[PDB]
């Protein structure tokens, strides 16, 4: 029996688009019926690859990889935006967290997760790109920020670029979305001094 995504794409469903709440990710499926979103504009890396890997799964599950009210004490997690509105009210992805400054500081961020699900874990995150350097300071305070995501099989360092861009859905900023598969027993480590759209919920699954 297939996975019914209704009016949402894989991106909107996997990212947790607020308009895909009632969608339910059943424990296993053979294929995905779809209607091809990302309410915050940006680039979803290896999107077609992900659609292929999620094409048929067993033992699928959505779990809380970094609890919102514990994992980030020294950062603000309540960031919402009108680009991802729900019920005429600004909101944000249900599987991600927009980390911003708290009390005028954005302390160096470091958090890690060990895969104890005995299955493959799909982790997704984002990198946010303001359009001017003043706002970069206001939101994250460091001018030359970095984001680092490392596992035993994945390693990448993201540098945000500050550029004036045309408005998309009324937004001049951008959030690029990335993902990786975490093998059982492996550890993934997130490090940043800004611009990290942190994983809030993640997914554990057996492929095929």
């Amino acid at each position: 029996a297939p996975l019914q995504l209704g009016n949402c794409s894989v991106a909107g469903w996997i990212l947790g688009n607020p308009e895909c709440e009632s969608l339910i990710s059943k424990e296993s499926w053979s294929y995905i019926v779809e209607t091809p979103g990302t309410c915050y504009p940006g680039y979803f890396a290896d999107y077609e690859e992900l659609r292929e890997q999620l094409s048929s799964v067993s033992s699928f599950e959505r779990f809380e990889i970094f609890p919102k009210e514990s994992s980030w004490p020294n950062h603000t997690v309540t960031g919402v935006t009108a680009s991802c509105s729900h019920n005429g009210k600004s909101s944000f992805y249900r599987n991600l967290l927009w980390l911003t400054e708290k009390n005028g500081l954005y302390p160096n961020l470091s958090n890690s997760y060990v895969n104890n699900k005995e299955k493959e874990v799909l982790v997704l995150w984002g990198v946010h790109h303001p359009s001017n350097i003043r706002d970069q300071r206001a939101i994250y305070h460091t001018e030359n920020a970095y984001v680092s995501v490392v596992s035993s099989h994945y390693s990448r360092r993201f540098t945000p670029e500050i550029a004036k861009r045309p408005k998309v859905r009324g937004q001049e900023g951008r959030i690029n979305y990335y993902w990786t598969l975490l093998e059982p027993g492996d550890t993934i480590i997130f490090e940043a001094n800004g611009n990290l759209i942190a994983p809030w919920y993640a997914f554990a699954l057996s492929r095929g």
Partner: antibody
Framework: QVQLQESGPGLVKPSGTLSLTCAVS?????????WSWVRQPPGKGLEWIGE???????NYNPSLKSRVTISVDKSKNQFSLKLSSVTAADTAVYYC???????????????????????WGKGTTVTVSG | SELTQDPAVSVALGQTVRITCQGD??????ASWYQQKPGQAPVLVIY???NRPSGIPDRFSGSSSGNTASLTITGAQAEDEADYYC????????????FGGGTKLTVLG
């Protein structure tokens, strides 16, 4: 529970310089806030004077720019206001207040598109007279 | 630019009144509202949109549409008789802060 309190002379001679200091307590000025000054002439509305960041960068009312100076002093947890060449038009109740951070572009969360002054000083009356 | 609001309006005891604030600056920044009584400092009643500070009664609500922000008072009480200023940040230049002229609210009855 930040609280503000103005202080300074209640009388300033014409062509003189008004000097007020706002004492900040219950919190640190080193923060993400815009420490602001507001005034209200007798029987008139509110007029924004200027704001200052703890770094020392300032943003002033254009109509008062060439007479206004707003300073910050982290040694005493205070910020101050100086207004030169005062006339009868500068007689007013002066308030110091606290504003939140903001963004100039549409690339920030909604919290950075508010403007308000939530905490206010009790206000101190300044009258310009000989 | 500037924020323009009616300088005076009346409302009967227990009725509902909507005070309007207009200005192109409201297209990119949220409008806050203050209540002021003679001899007292302004008191913030709306942070922006429809968020009230702690201690502000529920009958003070905020809405907006276009370049117009509105403060609605449902069931006006005697103590609501005061001046109401709208306030936002200019969207041009160095973004100076702008105040509305204020609205003097008379509570009849």
């Amino acid at each position: 529970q930040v609280q503000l309190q103005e202080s300074g002379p209640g009388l300033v001679k014409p062509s003189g310089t008004l000097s007020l200091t706002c004492a900040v307590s219950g919190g640190s000025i080193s923060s993400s806030n815009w420490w602001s000054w507001v005034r209200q002439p007798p029987g008139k509305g509110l007029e924004w004077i200027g704001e200052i960041y703890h770094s020392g960068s300032t943003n002033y009312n254009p109509s008062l720019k060439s007479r206004v100076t707003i300073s910050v002093d982290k040694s005493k947890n205070q910020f101050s206001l100086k207004l030169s060449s005062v006339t009868a038009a500068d007689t007013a109740v002066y308030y110091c207040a606290r504003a939140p951070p903001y963004c100039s572009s549409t690339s920030c969360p909604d919290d950075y598109y508010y403007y308000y002054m939530d905490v206010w000083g009790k206000g101190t009356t300044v009258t310009v007279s000989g | 630019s500037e924020l323009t609001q009616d300088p005076a309006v009346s409302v009967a005891l227990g009725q509902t009144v909507r005070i309007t604030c207009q200005g192109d600056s409201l297209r990119s920044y949220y409008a806050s509202w203050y209540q002021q009584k003679p001899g007292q400092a302004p008191v913030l009643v709306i942070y922006g949109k429809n968020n009230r500070p702690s201690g502000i009664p529920d009958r003070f609500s905020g809405s907006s549409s276009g370049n117009t922000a509105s403060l609605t008072i449902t069931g006006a009480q005697a103590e609501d008789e005061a001046d109401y200023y709208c306030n936002s940040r200019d969207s041009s230049g160095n973004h100076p802060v702008v105040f509305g002229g204020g609205t003097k609210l008379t509570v009849l009855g």
